[PDB]
Design a protein around this ligand. Structure first.
Ligand SMILES: O=C1NC(=O)[C@H](Cc2ccccc2)N1
Ligand code: NA
Length: 456
C-alpha cells in the first residue's frame, strides 16, 4: 500500500480554492523577476508590442493546456506524482517525475537566490554588511516555514500581495515613461534591431516558461472547489471556469511586468528595472530603493513556494510514504534545491525555456491522452495507492509508455521551432495505439474503482 494522510486524495469538504481565489494566486505567481529577463532579451529579436503578443499567446496556450491537465486533480483531489502512476508504471512514473521534480527544484534555488539578493540589498543599504549565502539560507528557511502551512498560507499571502504587486508595477511604468519623457505608444516599438528568431519560437519560450507548473498543476488544483454532483456539461463549465480564471490571472499580470522588463532593456540596455529606473531618474533615495527590494521579495514569495516547492514535496511523501511527510518533504526539497546551486547555470533562460518545453511536451500529451482518450475519465483511486494493481504493468513499470515518450521526443526534433507542439501531439496520438496494445495484456479498468467515493 502506498497511501498515507499527506499523499491522500483531497476530500470535497477539505477543499478551499474556488475560481476567484485561483486567479488571485496566478496573478501574484506570474509577477516574478524571471519574466523581466525573458521579455527583456526578447527585445533583441522583436519590438516590445510583439513581445507582449508573444506573451499573451504563450499565456493562452498554457491555459488551453491547463484546462486538460487540471481536470483530474480538481475532480479527484490527487497529486501530480500520484497521477503519473497511470500511464507510466507505479514506479516507472518516477522516471519522468524525477526529470520534473529536478526542474521544479532548479527553479526553487534560482528564485531563492534572487530573493536572497533582494534582502541582502535591503540590509547593505542600511548597514553596509553584504553577506549573501547567510541571506540565502535564511530565505530558503523562511519559505520552508511558510510552506508548512501549505495552500492556506499561499492563498492568503497572494490575495494581499496581488493588488500591492499590481500597484507597485503600474507605478513603475509611470516613473520610467515620465522620467524619460516618453509616451507609452512610443516605447511600444523601440525594440527588435537584431531579427532572426521566428515569432513561433517566441511564443514557445513563454510557453516553455510555465511548462513545469502547467504539467503538474495537480498539486495546486487538487485543492480547488468542486461539486461532485455535477454532470458532463457542468463539470466542463467548471473546468472552463477554472481555466478562464487562470487565464485572467497569468495574462494581465505577466503582460504588465513582461512589458517592464522589455521597457528596461530598450530604454537603458538592462532588463533589470533597478538599474533602468535609477539611471533614468538619476539616483533614488534609500527609502525608494529599499522599496524596490521589498518588491522583489514580495514578488518572489508569491511564486517560489507555490510553483517550485509544492511539487517535489508531494513527490517525496508519496513515493516514500512512511519515510516522508509533506512538511518533511518541504525541508528535504529546499535543502536539495539550494544544494543544486542553480545560480551558476550558464547560458540564458530563453534557450533553457526552449529546452523545458520540448522536454515536457510529450509528458503533458501522454497524461491528457491516458485520462481523457484511453480511459475516458474513468479511473481507480484504489489501485493508485497499492503496489500491485491495474497500474502496475510490468513489475511496476510500463515500458511501452516510456517508449512513446522517446519516439515522440525524437519526432519533436524534426520541427525544432515547434518541438513542443509536435511532441505533445505526437505523444498524444501514439499513446492511443500503444495503449490499445497494452490493454490486450493488462486491464484498463478495475472493480475497485467503485471505492473511489470512499476516498472523497
Ligand atoms: O516552472 C517554472 N518555475 C519557475 O520559477 C519559472 C517561472 C517562470 C519564469 C519565466 C517565464 C515563466 C515562468 N517557471
Ligand atoms: Na510572485
Amino acid at each position: 500500500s502506498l497511501l498515507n494522510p499527506s499523499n491522500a486524495p483531497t476530500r470535497y469538504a477539505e477543499r478551499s480554492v474556488g475560481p476567484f481565489s485561483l486567479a488571485a494566486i496566478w496573478f501574484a505567481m506570474a509577477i516574478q523577476v524571471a519574466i523581466f529577463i525573458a521579455a527583456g532579451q526578447m527585445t533583441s529579436s522583436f519590438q516590445v508590442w510583439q513581445v507582449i503578443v508573444a506573451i499573451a499567446a504563450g499565456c493562452t496556450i498554457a491555459v488551453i493546456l491547463l484546462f486538460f491537465t487540471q481536470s483530474a486533480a480538481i475532480r479527484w483531489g490527487i497529486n501530480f506524482t500520484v497521477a503519473a502512476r497511470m500511464p507510466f508504471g507505479i514506479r516507472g512514473s518516477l522516471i519522468p517525475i524525477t526529470l520534473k521534480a529536478l526542474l521544479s527544484l532548479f527553479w526553487f534555488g534560482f528564485q531563492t537566490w534572487l530573493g536572497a539578493l533582494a534582502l541582502d540589498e535591503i540590509t547593505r543599504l542600511l548597514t553596509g554588511f553584504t553577506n549573501l549565502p547567510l541571506w540565502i539560507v535564511i530565505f530558503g528557511a523562511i519559505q520552508v516555514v511558510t510552506t508548512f502551512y501549505g495552500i492556506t498560507f499561499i492563498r492568503w499571502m497572494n490575495v494581499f500581495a496581488s493588488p500591492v504587486l499590481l500597484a507597485m508595477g503600474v507605478y513603475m511604468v509611470y516613473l520610467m515613461l515620465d522620467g524619460a519623457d516618453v509616451s507609452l505608444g512610443e516605447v511600444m516599438s523601440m525594440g527588435g534591431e537584431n531579427p532572426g528568431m521566428p515569432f513561433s519560437t517566441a511564443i514557445m519560450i513563454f510557453v516553455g516558461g510555465w511548462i513545469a507548473v502547467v504539467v503538474s498543476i495537480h498539486d495546486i488544483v487538487k485543492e480547488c472547489k468542486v461539486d461532485p454532483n455535477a454532470s458532463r456539461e457542468g463539470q466542463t463549465k467548471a473546468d472552463a471556469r477554472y481555466a478562464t480564471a487562470q487565464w485572467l490571472g497569468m495574462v494581465p499580470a505577466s503582460i504588465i511586468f513582461g512589458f517592464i522588463g522589455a521597457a528596461s532593456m530598450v530604454l537603458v540596455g538592462e532588463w533589470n528595472p533597478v538599474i533602468a529606473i535609477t539611471e533614468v531618474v538619476g539616483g533614488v533615495s534609500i527609502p525608494m530603493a529599499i522599496l524596490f527590494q521589498v518588491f522583489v521579495l514580495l514578488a518572489t514569495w508569491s511564486t517560489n513556494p507555490a510553483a517550485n516547492l509544492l511539487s517535489p514535496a508531494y513527490t517525496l511523501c508519496s513515493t516514500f510514504p512512511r519515510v516522508f511527510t509533506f512538511k518533511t518533504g518541504v525541508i528535504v526539497s529546499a535543502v536539495v534545491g539550494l544544494l543544486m546551486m542553480p545560480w551558476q547555470f550558464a547560458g540564458v533562460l530563453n534557450t533553457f525555456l526552449n529546452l523545458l518545453a520540448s522536454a515536457l511536451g510529450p509528458l503533458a500529451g501522454i497524461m491528457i491522452s491516458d485520462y481523457f482518450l484511453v480511459r475516458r475519465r474513468r479511473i481507480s483511486l484504489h489501485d493508485l495507492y497499492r503496489t500491485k494493481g491495474i497500474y502496475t504493468y510490468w513489475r511496476g513499470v510500463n515500458w511501452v509508455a516510456l517508449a512513446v515518450y522517446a519516439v515522440a521526443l525524437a519526432v519533436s526534433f524534426l520541427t525544432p521551432d515547434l518541438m513542443f507542439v509536435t511532441g505533445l501531439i505526437a505523444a498524444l496520438l501514439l499513446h492511443i495505439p500503444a495503449m490499445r496494445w497494452v490493454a490486450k495484456t493488462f486491464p484498463l479498468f478495475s472493480e475497485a474503482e467503485s471505492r473511489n467515493e470512499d476516498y472523497l
